[PDB]
Design a protein around this ligand. Structure first.
Ligand code: HEM
Length: 152
């Protein structure tokens, strides 16, 4: 649960992402894969990437970063009223991709890391607080669907 002022902060931060969705999406995925290499093993189409240079050169990885961040932005713009948008993603991630909730924690922290890295001094404490709460809400609502499905 976020206040109106907190949602305003989230959507202000998101404007930074929308100015360069592919570059932000690329860096989020690279931070996830290099910080948590077990996550790469869930992607049949990226497991061939051995070095970060290969990851950086991969146009398909940038394409997938755009898909991921486009979906997250659509969810965030609902300001918590995201049941219809979130349900298919929870279902696909539990039943088809088999992504433990821990990896959603990993990517949430990676988003925070990338925002500070690309906008140093321009991602203030209030903005970090509101973005973190928004990602917690997203993860928590996914977690409820995972529990329904019995997925660990
Ligand atoms: C911000 C969180 C994330 C969002 C919004 C997101 C969104 C999406 C979307 C829109 C798709 C394509 C449609 C679908 O299959 O449902 C996708 C595919 C996928 N997601 Fe996620 N995802 C997230 C986090 C993760 C994480 C943490 C992992 C693994 C560590 C992951 C693994 C995958 C895989 C394996 C695919 C299939 C890729 C393919 O082979 O083309 N996702 N995701």
């Amino acid at each position: 649960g976020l206040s109106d002022g907190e949602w305003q902060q989230v959507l202000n931060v998101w404007g930074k992402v929308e100015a360069d969705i592919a570059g932000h999406g690329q860096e989020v995925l690279i931070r996830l894969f290099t910080g948590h290499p077990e996550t790469l093993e869930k992607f049949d189409k990226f497991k061939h990437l051995k070095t970060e240079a290969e990851m950086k050169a991969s146009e398909d990885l940038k394409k997938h970063g755009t898909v991921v961040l486009t979906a997250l932005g659509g969810i965030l713009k609902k300001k918590g009223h995201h049941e219809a948008e979130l349900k298919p993603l929870a279902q696909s991630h539990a039943t088809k991709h088999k992504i433990p909730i821990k990896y959603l924690e990993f990517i949430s922290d990676a988003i925070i890391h990338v925002l500070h890295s690309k906008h140093p001094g321009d991602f203030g404490a209030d903005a970090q607080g509101a973005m973190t709460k928004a990602l917690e809400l997203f993860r928590n609502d996914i977690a409820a669907k995972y529990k329904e499905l019995g997925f660990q």
